[model samples]
Target: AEVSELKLTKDNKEVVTLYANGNAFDKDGNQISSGTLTLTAKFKDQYGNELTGKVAGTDYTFESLNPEVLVVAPDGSVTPIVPGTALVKVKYGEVTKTIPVTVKANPVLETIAVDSTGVSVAKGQKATFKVTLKDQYGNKFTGNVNVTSDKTETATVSVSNSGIGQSEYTVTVNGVAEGSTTITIKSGTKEVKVPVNVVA
Candidate 1:
């Protein structure tokens, strides 16, 4: 007699899909370790015509299939808590639809180390150095790193990625004035320093 069917859609589509650190996740799905997403529903009658403002509070209920990984609010908000998969069940007026969700872990930098203990570059010449990054679990971390020289007047430093995971950094040191300087490598909040000697 009345509109008795309901369906869910996200981003104007019916399939559920989201990226890390998006509205459904926090900081690329790593910083906050949890995030929320909002879902929309459409109401229709038995004849398939759409209905507007047919009442959500009395007609709908939401539940999460995996509460350990994700949770769903009564208002159709989904929260991700870990790297896993879960399904959200939306029920309205005897009609039900399941939304599948997948969560991913965020990458983090835990340690930084230079390949060489000491480096020396001659005036008008350049020397190359290597650096590596690891995570808390000692896994190689492949991401952007910042390199700097403490005494730019004495020596100059430049860095590039090797396209490798663990041993991924190449630091080039140029002797500017036949003096010594410190080279610093940074990733995330972790940093490491290396001593460079410039010779005439």
Candidate 2:
């Protein structure tokens, strides 16, 4: 008698298969009675590749050697690997299938940098500061920032121009008091603030 071939079916979410034949004759030369046969599966892309790391969910299944029925895990494995054509195959059996999985890329954040330290300006003095803003991918931004204070009645600060990369701005305050202001960069969801202290 010829040995039977294993068959497997796979979907977007999981891999499934059924076992055939029984243990009466013991064709595989193993004790076949009321026993359990372990089945393990490996996954790859649609390109017939093999998974490297441990994928989420159970990649393995089992079957009763007595009735020869395949039992699938309740939850299939979760793969975060790069999406593409992939395959899932069973071990101890020649059952295998392919699937197309899609993987999503992570998000990006914008970057902003300002010149060192805060400035101490007298009541009638002027001060200059440099600022630069860039995206997570390194795209520079040229834009104006806003300045505010917890004690606005004492002093005020503001930006001059807006650009994509770098810019210089002058901050002037009148009739100084003992107070401070913060210069903040605003671009999209990214913001950076530099503190400026002043004296009368």
Candidate 3:
């Protein structure tokens, strides 16, 4: 009897242990995007003697039922192409196992809305603001938002993603001198503006 366990790793970290009659979950239980998946096997004898230096293609073989969703290499490495599902079959000797994999799309930047009307900051000081992102359905979108300041000499703006799914962002304004400028938040062709006043 073949007594061994098949495991799947993502980004070099063990994510799930495959069973002869089980499925696999992607990173963080979220949809799989453009990422890497590697498979390895752990084998031991009846006396619990660990077997090392085993090769993937030689010791076992891997195959993906759906090449359009997930592509599996001969060495058991998987790459996700689109948002869909696929089955990976692993064979060792006369024993075979299959793992179901699901892939999801990476959220795209939809719209950026600044929460602050106008903020005041002293020279060489900083002010903070809040921004919310949403998709076409008005659902919270967690992705990247590009921010720029119209007059960097007066003030500079920076943005950072916040919380799960990056549904929100924290906008920071660095005051350079006594002046006013517009802070622009952009997501694709959609844009929003917030005013900043820098006092000496």
Candidate 4:
């Protein structure tokens, strides 16, 4: 048969038309029996290499396979099991064509956690407040942290990082007012508050 125009339907199905310039397939070969035809489309890379894993919805075209062939859906969202481009090739009868596909970049941030729970400290002494910061990907951030209090001038205190991730610091208030002192830790976009009360 001569080269035919290959077209893919909106439903992701493929169709091949056979035109005779008046006469093409013989009477014997033209008659096809009903049967199941399997065609494998190997989603490939830009360089024409087969891709590992399966992605949902991504389509690969097959030209002139059988009377018709349906690609079995992977049943899930199309996700390249591996990193990089993938290839899909159709194998039916004695024809094969490779299709290129790209794999999307993976997301790093999975979760971000910040504890704002406050604590209490004694008067005329240093009150240490601990705050924890963690990234969605489990990465710990480090840097000079600033701690703010509800009574900043009323209660004289110092703040410093005790350790990484641990987010501990010291607060020394000479004469803390009789009330709750809110300790706010600020670093990047992360902030936590710990309330401390001083009794006379």
Candidate 5:
């Protein structure tokens, strides 16, 4: 209807401001992880008047600034693909407004893979093991992992990320004396163990 001032809502709720005190909210006003929304809308024309009737909100135009984080379907349904923040453009006629989306960490430690299941290092020396946290989708899970040594007197283990914002990790194992021990890694209630041997 030749909309000049465009506004959209999900279940009659207006789209949130892109930055409201440094946090984003869903268009439908729902929380993270369940990020699908179909909206209803209305607009004002060049005469500066409201349509005065709710209309089906599709075929107008929808775009996601970050496709990997939030994706908008052709039918106007917004879905989440990962945990991040993205801006969505809902355009109608000559007017367009943005929908801000921020998804939280949805981590599932479906698998914990290690580069080495066993290792031997000289006493008072160090060794490094690589660990990959796999998500339910089989990709590297994006979150933190916990590492500990079974016998700190014999060996000590500390966990470090492969890099910033990465799911892979590096476990540095320190051998204190000539003994045998185990290093344990925990991710989302699931854990794996690696045997360590200290040589004289």
Candidate 6:
């Protein structure tokens, strides 16, 4: 008859029940930028009976304690921002319940892309390109941005930043001795190579 507790459900199942000992995160604390969790705030009784007629805006209010870690929209859609713990609180006329979310570090290993497929840099100068990883849906995510050079003497590869505050990855190829080489940007098992020509 009345609301006694708040439960989180996903795909017609209790979200916490699927994890280890009622853990809210994934098997290893869910990936930081891997995927999103579509959550539903369910109202239940003390004995585990679901209650109805509890509307979203009127019956309850959702609040996110750490928006950066886990961003919860007005409709309870969650998106991970960084590798950390986030809490979402549901309040129903004084009765409140919190759901703790743990976000782990799993670099996005989907499609590999760069600003320029092939680049030209002057001798003793440098050329930089933006590296990115996208899921199947074209959503941006972070990855362990790394670069490898075929000949370090001809051209050197390095990463200037990881996230750039907006999921940006910057890779720079520095001209070493006026030669040619290839720079391979890799994360997980997916990689992309770019031709580097050091001009005079």
lDDT of 5: 0.67
All candidates' TM-scores? Answer: 0.50, 0.38, 0.55, 0.36, 0.50, 0.48
Point to the candidate with the largest lDDT: 3
Error of 3 at 80 (Å): 1.8
Top of the candidates by TM-score: 3
lDDT for model 4, please: 0.40
**Model 2 stretches with alpha carbons more than 4 Å out:** 1-109, 162-175
Q: Candidate 1 at 102: error in angstroms? A: 1.1
Sort all candidates by TM-score, best to worst.
3, 1, 5, 6, 2, 4
After superposition, which runs of candidate 3 have C-alpha atoms over 4 Å from their true positions? 10-12, 15-36, 44-51, 111-117, 120-184, 195-200
Two-way lDDT contest, 3 vs 6, winner? 3
**Candidate 2, run of 10 with poorest lDDT:** 16-25
True-vs-predicted CA distance for residue 146, candidate 3, Å: 6.8
For model 6, the local distance difference test gives 0.67
Question: What would the per-residue lDDT of candidate 5 be over residues 1-200, giving only the tens digit for each residue?
Answer: 45443333344445562222222344553433333354344567678677664434543666778897776764466556667787767667667777566655554568988899698999989998788878664667676688888899899988775334568888898889898988888877888888999999
Cα RMSD for candidates in order? 8.3, 18.9, 8.0, 19.5, 11.0, 11.0
Candidate closer to the true structure by lDDT (higher is better), 2 or 4: 2
The positional error of residue 117 in candidate 6, measured at the CA in angstroms, is 1.5
TM-score of 1: 0.50
* Clashes in predicted model 4: 20
Lowest summed-lDDT stretch of 10 residues in model 4?
Answer: 17-26
Write one digit per residue (lDDT tens) for candidate 6, span 1-200. Answer: 33454545444444532221222433333423333455566666667788777667676677789986776766666566666777878776667777786665543456876789798999999888888787443546655666789999899988866533334687778888887889888776888989989999
lDDT for model 2, please: 0.43
Clashes of each: 1, 18, 2, 20, 0, 0
Candidate 1 per-residue lDDT over residues 1-200, each given as its tens digit: 23243333334333333333332323223222232345566666778787766555467767788998876678776556777777777677677777667765654677786689878889989999778787554656776688889999989888775433444778898998877879888777778888989999
Q: Residue 31 in model 3: shift from native, Å?
A: 14
lDDT of each residue in 1-200, candidate 4, tens digit only: 11122222212333121122111122332422232222234444556665566432343324321111222233211222333444544432344455443333332323224343544555565554344444333444334456566786545555544333343334443446656656565666556565666766
